[PDB]
Amino acid sequence: MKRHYEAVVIGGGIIGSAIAYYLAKENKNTALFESGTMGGRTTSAAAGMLGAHAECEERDAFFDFAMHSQRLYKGLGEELYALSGVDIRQHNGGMFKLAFSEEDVLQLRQMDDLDSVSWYSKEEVLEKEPYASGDIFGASFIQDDVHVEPYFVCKAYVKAAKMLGAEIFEHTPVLHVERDGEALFIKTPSGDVWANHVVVASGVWSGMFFKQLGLNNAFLPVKGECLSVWNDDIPLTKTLYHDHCYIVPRKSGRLVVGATMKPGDWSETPDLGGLESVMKKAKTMLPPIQNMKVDRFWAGLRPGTKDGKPYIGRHPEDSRILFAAGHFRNGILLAPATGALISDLIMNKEVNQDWLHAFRIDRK
Amino acid sequence: MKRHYEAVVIGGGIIGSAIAYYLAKENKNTALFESGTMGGRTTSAAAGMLGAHAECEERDAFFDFAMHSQRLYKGLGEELYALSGVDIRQHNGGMFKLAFSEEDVLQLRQMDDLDSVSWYSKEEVLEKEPYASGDIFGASFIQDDVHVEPYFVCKAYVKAAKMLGAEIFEHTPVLHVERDGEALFIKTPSGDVWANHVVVASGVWSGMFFKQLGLNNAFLPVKGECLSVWNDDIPLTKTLYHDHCYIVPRKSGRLVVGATMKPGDWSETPDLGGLESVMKKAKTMLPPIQNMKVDRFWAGLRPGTKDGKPYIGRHPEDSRILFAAGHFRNGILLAPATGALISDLIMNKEVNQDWLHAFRIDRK
Amino acid sequence: MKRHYEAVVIGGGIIGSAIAYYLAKENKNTALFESGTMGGRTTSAAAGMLGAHAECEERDAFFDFAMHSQRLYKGLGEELYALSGVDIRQHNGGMFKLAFSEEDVLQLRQMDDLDSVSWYSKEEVLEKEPYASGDIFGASFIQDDVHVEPYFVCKAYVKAAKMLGAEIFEHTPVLHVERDGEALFIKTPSGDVWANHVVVASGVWSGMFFKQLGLNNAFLPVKGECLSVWNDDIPLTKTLYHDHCYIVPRKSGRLVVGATMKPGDWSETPDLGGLESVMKKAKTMLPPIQNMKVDRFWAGLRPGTKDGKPYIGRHPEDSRILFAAGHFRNGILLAPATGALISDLIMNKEVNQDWLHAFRIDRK
Amino acid sequence: MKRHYEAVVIGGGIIGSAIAYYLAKENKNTALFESGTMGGRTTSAAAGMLGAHAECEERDAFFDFAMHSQRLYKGLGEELYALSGVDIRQHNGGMFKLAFSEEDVLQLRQMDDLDSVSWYSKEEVLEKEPYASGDIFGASFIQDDVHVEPYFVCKAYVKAAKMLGAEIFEHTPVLHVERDGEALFIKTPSGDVWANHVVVASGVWSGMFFKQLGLNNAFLPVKGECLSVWNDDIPLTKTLYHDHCYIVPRKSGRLVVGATMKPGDWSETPDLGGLESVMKKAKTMLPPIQNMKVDRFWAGLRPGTKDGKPYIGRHPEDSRILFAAGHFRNGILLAPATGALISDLIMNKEVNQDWLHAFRIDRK
Numbered sequence A, B, C, D: 001m002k003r004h005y006e007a008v009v010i011g012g013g014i015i016g017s018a019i020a021y022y023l024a025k026e027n028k029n030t031a032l033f034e035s036g037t038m039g040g041r042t043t044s045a046a047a048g049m050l051g052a053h054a055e056c057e058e059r060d061a062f063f064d065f066a067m068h069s070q071r072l073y074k075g076l077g078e079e080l081y082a083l084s085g086v087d088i089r090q091h092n093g094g095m096f097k098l099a100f101s102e103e104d105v106l107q108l109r110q111m112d113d114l115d116s117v118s119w120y121s122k123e124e125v126l127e128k129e130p131y132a133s134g135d136i137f138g139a140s141f142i143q144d145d146v147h148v149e150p151y152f153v154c155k156a157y158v159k160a161a162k163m164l165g166a167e168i169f170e171h172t173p174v175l176h177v178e179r180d181g182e183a184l185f186i187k188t189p190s191g192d193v194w195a196n197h198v199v200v201a202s203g204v205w206s207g208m209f210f211k212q213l214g215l216n217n218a219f220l221p222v223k224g225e226c227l228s229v230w231n232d233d234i235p236l237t238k239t240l241y242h243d244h245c246y247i248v249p250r251k252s253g254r255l256v257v258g259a260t261m262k263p264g265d266w267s268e269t270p271d272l273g274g275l276e277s278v279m280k281k282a283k284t285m286l287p288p289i290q291n292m293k294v295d296r297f298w299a300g301l302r303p304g305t306k307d308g309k310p311y312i313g314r315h316p317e318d319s320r321i322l323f324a325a326g327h328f329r330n331g332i333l334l335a336p337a338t339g340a341l342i343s344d345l346i347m348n349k350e351v352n353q354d355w356l357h358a359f360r361i362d363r364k
């Protein structure tokens, strides 16, 4: 482990892992410190949906950043593979955001003004996905909201960053950041390092660093538990989605099913009531899933923030320090764009003022 | 593997495993053939309740055999331990068979005429188990219906039988039984053996042998799925039981929760709807369980028979062949008594004519 | 479960699965009976190498078959994906059959005259695979001996078959095959069925059927123990092969390592001595593997025949009954060719008489 | 989570757990903050030997402490069961410290003058343990160096503590300990708390607190890798010990084997080289283990200090702050004595000055 780097990334999740990749692409000698194993926390609990549309509320800049990030996923799997040997496992089936009420229809039809987003009548859906619940008023088919396996998207980025110089240190918790002197100074139980730039990408745990650097930005964990089953009997190509819950078909024959939302809960293991809730919900969307064999059950801590938006930007009082945390429900989707934006702020290139202002560290 | 044995046991579950023990106790040179690993099937899916009372319907001989078998469990754990080093993990907390309706009360109060079976008012129960549902009309406390870990009761018997001569062969499926010649003849992919006595203890799979020996006795699988959670917050000493479902506290801090009843289903892995059903049921009995961390989920095939009673006895046309299969819901409880009875029929001792007639192979 | 099928396949490993698929494709009312779960035995333990050049020490019928089957894999992945939604995870890195002595070189050079196969020097190997043992005398590069994940290619076959109308019955052991009427009669615990064609594809457990049908063909299990690790640090694109042992890099970042050769052992879980043995071997081939984190360990029973060759074809005295078992170390590779052969025979089409004679059921 | 507690224990491994229990027993409004789950780190990796005679190469204060702690285990199981419902799984077989050379004998004989410790000859050992290596020169029998299952004794302490009023907070990392008011101030992501006594028991991660409080005591992880097997065939009642390596027979039928010694490695999962190493060692001590089925593999970080001795006591410049970390290879054994010591110090009772000086925080 060297003693000085031009840039150091604190966090081995998909965010920090992506940032490390883009920096090493800029040939910027950089290192990354992960308290545990790469993509070992929230990142490996994610479904992997590139849900720019499905998670759309309004038409602000957040949505544009997301759409931008979604474009970035084009070919990215090939890029990282040729450098890692790790397949991100992309599935282009698309998504069916289901409607079970008139209110659901009103909400889904607000995307009529967008491409690759078309409305399907109940019969049109059941013709493509015969086993989707028959209680549907129809669904919105989002062709681009496809999916990938987050754990491998992360491992791909990391393995690729290494083959580009990046030095990755696991089981190396960063304990403190000293912005004193003329260069930044980080301390770990394995040693202390110097850098010209420090990027906080510790997910929901990032608060500690903000505080350390005088900032007050807080994070709230939003626990989500899921399960998977083996779908050996019915066909299911498109991802079924409804009210923040989903059933995504993996290329392995497994269906990733989930999401409870438990604010303030820091535990990372599923509770009985949580899984029961997911099982109950999934049956209303895919009745046949009740006969499928259960596989695994897990949980993750979504990095929540006061306004639901992430913090992606320079420290107000010190541009040498940056932050990329609080991607709540879209960390996987927004990785490519978050990485590029941080790498572009370090390389001091020109960046979209709207996005940069949208995610600024000092918000009302 | 020898070529001749005075007695051969076909089945390594808890039944065959117990029979092998008692025979080797009689110093009868015997061997056992298990298609897979010992106690690897239904036996290791069982909760381990010695439910002679809880599974009581009427007051026939079946119930007496059960009560007898329950007595046999006295000290048995010590006996087998001193010979195996394997602890059966016995828990003497007792059982609370809960009542949620007047009909439940009427049914439970029919045991008033028995010792170690007392009625508890709602308040008396909540005083002993504060977290049991408050919707109860009270419960029947069955002091003797305690529990053990079946897998280890089985391993204990087997390990003990070995230290007594018994020769145990795993991964040795018995393919056929020839009662021709003057001695029995069994065939396995690993060889053929001769014996003076053959005992069929293949659980729900025993049908094949009955047929082979001209008998028509059929078996129906009754699949049951369960799960376990970690109870790190509340006290729970007594086993909560209701309508064939239960919550049994293990000495490890885990709660074994279960039982769906799926007739005709031969699959041994839980389906999503099954577990959801168990989770839902358990919450009505122990509301707090919903906050507990899930551990594992599994399933087993209860050996079902036409009249709900097992077949424990000699082949009508050949006393050299015996059967001990179809213990449906009480295989763990009835092992000690089933073993002793079979070993007593081989050693040609005198046995209870009622039990012997109750479980005869040729029934109406 | 119907009462009559044109064809009944007994066994659901990759072989029976492939067979069921091709029959479904030929539009034949077909059913497959699997004792447990599809691909749950030997198939799930295999590395998945299409090692057609491990059977070229003599360019006979066997080698032509292996080569032909290897050819059939071109495009098979896409074909099955379209119908299954399951990715077989094919990796085209190729293979480096390492040499650690002159004799090794002499032996390995003998296949230089083969197409897509060429020799590399100790320094030309290290140029591609820098971390390969520095004690090698070079290696033969086999471009076409790529690899897939056996379990998924099996599940893809089965799923594709289901979509084409094949009826798959898991947890349905076939107990006995009867021939008396103008058709066959199969017996399972879940009822009986009639067919015009029965195909025995029970892997190493096929013996009982051969014996049931008058043949004495024997099967001997040859246990193989393996392990896997995570290769997060060094590059490895080619599979390293030596003395039947190997290191195959999967697209997940895992290295599948192995195989012990234990004749007559029917246990399916690895023992300590065997794993130590595999670890030791792997280290001689890829020194760095010593610092890699262990993932999993497992074992499987290669189905061995007296001559180590499969029995693929009709029953000598009944062309309604076919066999397809005993693929020692090449079950995965030969899956396509074996399935096409059995399917074509049942369709009574024209077939290479050399192969048909090479796999005769009654070999001297 | 309240705002003020008399005592706050930081760390939930067996040490902090024990401490929390004794304080609860002394009726002290106490809270314990565990970063993840109770006993989820090093504690869960330990074998659980009460090896008090591994620290007698010099009968000093350390040995007296070890002996005293070993004494405290008498009855501890029952005491914690009564309150927890958790069995600690104590096994009293004793230990055979094997000798493979004359020097081994010379060294091991030196403790013959100790009570309950006696020497056995190569033939007297094989009389008790027939399968012990035939290459031994005999062994020392330590009757009191029995074993328990670390995880459960930890969970028993915690549960017993909860019943006595201790408030345990999992998934609650303590970020910083502040001293300024008349009391201490602990900071967690889930809020802040005040206390009159803080006890640092974070195992190998304790360094950051020492440093936060002005001390420079360092911790170095010494990774230990292990594995387990099923011993279904041979008898083994005594634990086999040699050169810090061991084979402990558990009451489940498992053999816990191990320990590699890897200084400075913070990874918590075993690597291939380390496991091969452990397997090789075990085979020299118990040849038959070679044919046993592998169960699991795991690792843990022994918390190492400059002198391999724990830091147990008050902060040199603030008696409100205590430490209890760095129990290299004896954390389990010393759990009772360490907990009683810290509890008594907080209760400001009389304490053995020799031990208090042996574990001083500022050792030259």
Ligand SMILES: Cc1cc2nc3c(=O)[nH]c(=O)nc-3n(C[C@H](O)[C@H](O)[C@H](O)COP(=O)(O)OP(=O)(O)OC[C@H]3O[C@@H](n4cnc5c(N)ncnc54)[C@H](O)[C@@H]3O)c2cc1C
Binding pocket: A010, A011, A012, A013, A014, A015, A016, A033, A034, A035, A036, A037, A038, A039, A040, A041, A042, A043, A044, A045, A046, A047, A048, A049, A050, A051, A172, A173, A174, A175, A201, A202, A203, A204, A205, A206, A222, A223, A224, A225, A226, A258, A259, A299, A300, A301, A302, A303, A324, A325, A326, A327, A328, A329, A330, A331, A332, A333, A334
């Ligand atoms: C059930 C569930 C389903 C989801 N599905 C989707 C989905 O379909 N699509 C999508 O886009 N998003 C999804 N998400 C959200 C997504 O998982 C997250 O937003 C994303 O993983 C966050 O990534 P991260 O890199 O910011 O943080 P994390 O992945 O949580 O990692 C932070 C990392 O920093 C490390 N760290 C913490 N403190 C320190 C320290 N002091 N020093 C060094 N390292 C430290 C951690 O150990 C960890 O490796 C889902 C979330 C959940 C819970």
Ligand SMILES: Cc1cc2nc3c(=O)[nH]c(=O)nc-3n(C[C@H](O)[C@H](O)[C@H](O)COP(=O)(O)OP(=O)(O)OC[C@H]3O[C@@H](n4cnc5c(N)ncnc54)[C@H](O)[C@@H]3O)c2cc1C
Binding pocket: B010, B011, B012, B013, B014, B015, B016, B033, B034, B035, B036, B037, B038, B039, B040, B041, B042, B043, B044, B045, B046, B047, B048, B049, B050, B051, B172, B173, B174, B175, B201, B202, B203, B204, B205, B206, B222, B223, B224, B225, B226, B258, B259, B299, B300, B301, B302, B303, B324, B325, B326, B327, B328, B329, B330, B331, B332, B333, B334
């Ligand atoms: C969810 C669940 C909970 C339960 N809880 C309880 C409880 O609390 N108390 C209680 O008393 N009972 C309980 N039971 C029931 C109990 O598990 C069974 O009655 C008992 O395990 C049956 O034991 P067995 O030995 O007859 O059969 P099994 O344990 O099913 O074993 C039969 C054995 O024979 C082998 N075999 C089969 N065919 C062959 C062959 N051809 N050659 C060689 N070997 C062969 C099998 O592989 C297997 O090892 C429960 C069951 C379930 C499903």
Ligand SMILES: Cc1cc2nc3c(=O)[nH]c(=O)nc-3n(C[C@H](O)[C@H](O)[C@H](O)COP(=O)(O)OP(=O)(O)OC[C@H]3O[C@@H](n4cnc5c(N)ncnc54)[C@H](O)[C@@H]3O)c2cc1C
Binding pocket: C010, C011, C012, C013, C014, C015, C016, C033, C034, C035, C036, C037, C038, C039, C040, C041, C042, C043, C044, C045, C046, C047, C048, C049, C050, C051, C172, C173, C174, C175, C201, C202, C203, C204, C205, C206, C222, C223, C224, C225, C226, C258, C259, C260, C299, C300, C301, C302, C303, C324, C325, C326, C327, C328, C329, C330, C331, C332, C333, C334
């Ligand atoms: C460690 C190891 C590594 C290997 N690596 C390779 C490799 O790289 N490449 C390669 O080509 N090969 C490899 N092989 C070999 C390959 O795994 C086998 O040849 C192949 O799996 C055999 O497939 P199968 O379908 O014939 O049998 P199996 O996969 O063993 O399945 C037979 C099936 O029939 C079922 N069955 C049995 N009896 C009955 C009954 N009465 N009724 C119904 N079903 C029944 C079984 O339960 C099972 O599903 C390897 C093997 C091992 C052990």
Ligand SMILES: Cc1cc2nc3c(=O)[nH]c(=O)nc-3n(C[C@H](O)[C@H](O)[C@H](O)COP(=O)(O)OP(=O)(O)OC[C@H]3O[C@@H](n4cnc5c(N)ncnc54)[C@H](O)[C@@H]3O)c2cc1C
Binding pocket: D010, D011, D012, D013, D014, D015, D016, D033, D034, D035, D036, D037, D038, D039, D040, D041, D042, D043, D044, D045, D046, D047, D048, D049, D050, D051, D172, D173, D174, D175, D201, D202, D203, D204, D205, D206, D222, D223, D224, D225, D226, D258, D259, D260, D299, D300, D301, D302, D303, D324, D325, D326, D327, D328, D329, D330, D331, D332, D333, D334
């Ligand atoms: C392979 C192996 C075998 C062993 N065998 C034995 C044996 O036979 N006998 C024996 O006596 N010893 C044995 N030991 C040693 C023994 O395991 C340890 O000494 C003991 O586990 C240490 O316990 P601890 O509670 O001090 O630390 P740990 O058990 O490591 O736990 C420290 C705890 O503090 C938590 N923590 C860390 N930072 C924070 C924070 N900021 N806030 C809150 N919580 C935090 C951790 O997450 C963890 O729960 C063995 C060790 C190994 C590795």
Ligand SMILES: CC(=O)NCC(=O)O
Binding pocket: A047, A049, A051, A054, A055, A224, A244, A258, A259, A302, A328, A329, A330
């Ligand atoms: C993008 C998305 O839908 N994520 C799911 C979740 O966070 O639960």
Ligand SMILES: CC(=O)NCC(=O)O
Binding pocket: B047, B049, B051, B054, B055, B224, B244, B258, B259, B302, B328, B329, B330
């Ligand atoms: C004896 C008993 O209650 N068993 C439970 C079950 O079989 O589901």
Ligand SMILES: CC(=O)NCC(=O)O
Binding pocket: C047, C049, C051, C054, C224, C244, C258, C259, C302, C328, C329, C330
């Ligand atoms: C030649 C080959 O693929 N061998 C694999 C195995 O059976 O271990």
Ligand SMILES: CC(=O)NCC(=O)O
Binding pocket: D047, D049, D051, D054, D224, D244, D258, D259, D302, D328, D329, D330
């Ligand atoms: C002496 C002793 O118990 N050692 C265990 C270990 O730390 O590996």
